[model samples]
Target: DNPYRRGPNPTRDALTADGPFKVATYTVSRLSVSGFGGGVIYYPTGTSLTFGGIAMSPGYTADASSLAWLGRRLASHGFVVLVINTNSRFDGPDSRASQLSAALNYLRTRSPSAVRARLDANRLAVAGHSMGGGGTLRIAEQNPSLKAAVPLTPWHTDKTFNTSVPVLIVGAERDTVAPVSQHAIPFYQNLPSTTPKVYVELCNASHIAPNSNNAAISVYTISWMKLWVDNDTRYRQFLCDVKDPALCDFRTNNRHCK
Candidate 1:
């Protein structure tokens, strides 16, 4: 009855591997917009078909380039990905959330030539790392229209979120900055049981590990977005089936689908 259980899982591969679609990228400067600026747009190449767009924000004191790796990985998988810079490096979760919304609007209305018509305004996702990750959760709470939200090692004082949107919270096992016991665990536990959510802790990872070049993060992140944003049931197996915990060094992984 399920199609994803039978095929070669795309989640197991690296970003450099050839996917069904090719990827191309461009930059959107702040001058092009009134409040937001310095963003990178990654889209599927040689195709005009509309696809989901993901607005990704970097953590506090980080630039858009900090998440370039993740943006490229997501774009290669068929979603239009926007990695944006905050108005200031010191922006907090609320300000970052606002900037994330602004970035999505810009992507929908003023995308560069390469992905102008290709970016789907409706099918959207939001993601971020550290403080940006916390902001991602805040954005999801404020905007229920988002198909999915991925928060990588989020950092926020408040851990409770009131949104039904599907969420995937990636955490670092060894993180001291935003310890899972304090941040990720509480955030995931406080969400209503009605929301579809997943909590994944990368083994021995530090606070900055998720943002660095890590294949495991790419696998789960791409799979979560594809399943939720694209509604591609093909990725369901990776999320629901727990054949082995050691497969991806998923020291602690939990999923709830309802």
Candidate 2:
């Protein structure tokens, strides 16, 4: 039943690196929104395959390149991924949240293009790192239509999150910029218990850990997306399994799955 174990699972691991479909990417300028400009779009090579879309933004003052690794990973797994560039370097969570929504809408509008037919607008998700991570939560709160949200070491002022959408909050144990105690922990704690969510604190990890390419981070993220966005039951093992938590790098008491 637990198919998301580290070793291998046909459903979850098949698309992690190279999946049945080839991956391709392109850039689009003049997004629908003014503040946000162009964005890098990643999608499968072939058409006729409807896939979920994920819009990702970088941390404050950081460009989309910071999240390129994650975007590419998700694209290879059959999801149309967009790494958005904010209007300015100093854009905070609110601005980034608006940009994330605009990016997703832009992708949806540009149909007849590579990603147009392949993108399933209704099954969209949002993600970000640092300030952008906090923005991810804000966008989720603003847009109840979002299927899922992934915030990586998010930094936000508001801790009260009222949403039914599933969320996966990744935190760094040693993060100094947005310490887990202040940001991630409170963010998760404030979320309604009825909301399907999980909190993962990486041991000795820094605030920038999720911005880079990490196997553990990739697995957790992709699995959560699959389980929620795609409504794929196969990924439920990784998220709900109470036995052998180490299968997905779970510490003795640092991880919470509900």
Candidate 3:
């Protein structure tokens, strides 16, 4: 049997050379909001956090060890990240939204002492890969409080979905499972024109470019999150249109930074 239980598994450990964080198992019941069915939750020490549902669902286990590693990297930068399971091994829109909402509610309700005064509800960001990415959009559509959203190779119908918050959509030109032309490009166009949006099509990348053996995707994602979550405008150079070509790699259907 896999040491990792399929349902309702909770654990906590520290990131290497980083601060404290808790990895929680699913506890809420499907019929009840208070019960477990949502997914796993991870919270770091700082207020600035990232929520991840990056794994392919439908009985698939999140690369927990990998996320622990990612948490370590983000913690070095003072971010309290959270990674949720969503629901059903497969990624579903409502399931992902419910999981995300549940996690947000947990963070919002925690007593100041519970999180060591490190949790900040005002500064929250949600991101995911593939179906999880597509689910991020659906979740954001219902929740307006999100500060930023990052979707890597998101698989969704409307590439032009709109939202008030900023969005970073990363895709691979070579990816066929979630092709850049069909999935990513259209998703970028669907973003609300009012908010800031960016699309990055990496060279020789695939559906999981950011997670590909290539560390470049992680490097770029970390940098991208740093700007939005850490409030670093310098990193913003890579997102804005007409602001700095040296920083951004705009190619198709990109908007001008006003």
lDDT of 3 by residue, 1-258 (tens): 422111122111221123333343232334443412433333443333443222221112343232444434543444445555444555455466566666566556632343424554566777766766776676677777776677767776656565766677777777787777788777777776666677776766666554533344444455456555555544444444423222224432333234
Give the C-alpha miss distance for residue 51 in model 3, angstroms.
13
| Predicted structure 3, TM vs. truth | 0.68
Query: How do all the candidates rank in terms of lDDT, highest first?
Result: 1, 2, 3
Candidate 2 TM-score, true structure as reference: 0.87
Per-residue alpha-carbon lDDT of candidate 2 for residues 1-258, written as tens digits (9 for 90 to 100)? 422222134453453355455678787665545547677888877556688899998998788888888888887776889888888879998889998988878877753366877787778999999999988999998898998999998999888877777888888888999988899988888888777778777776888987787665677788788877877666666666534322323321223333
Candidate number with the higher TM-score (1 or 3):
1
Q: How close is candidate 1 to the true structure, as a TM-score?
A: 0.89
Off by over 4 Å in 2: 1-20, 30-35, 242-258
CA lDDT scores, all candidates in order: 0.80, 0.77, 0.52
Residue 146, candidate 3: alpha-carbon lDDT:
76
Worst 10 residues of 2 by lDDT: 245-254
How high is the lDDT of residue 13 in model 3? Answer: 20
What would the TM-scores of all predictions be? 0.89, 0.87, 0.68
Residue 252, candidate 2: how far off, in angstroms?
14
Every candidate's CA RMSD: 3.4, 4.4, 9.8
Residue-wise C-alpha lDDT for candidate 1, range 162-199, written one tens digit per residue? 98889888888889998999998788888877788888
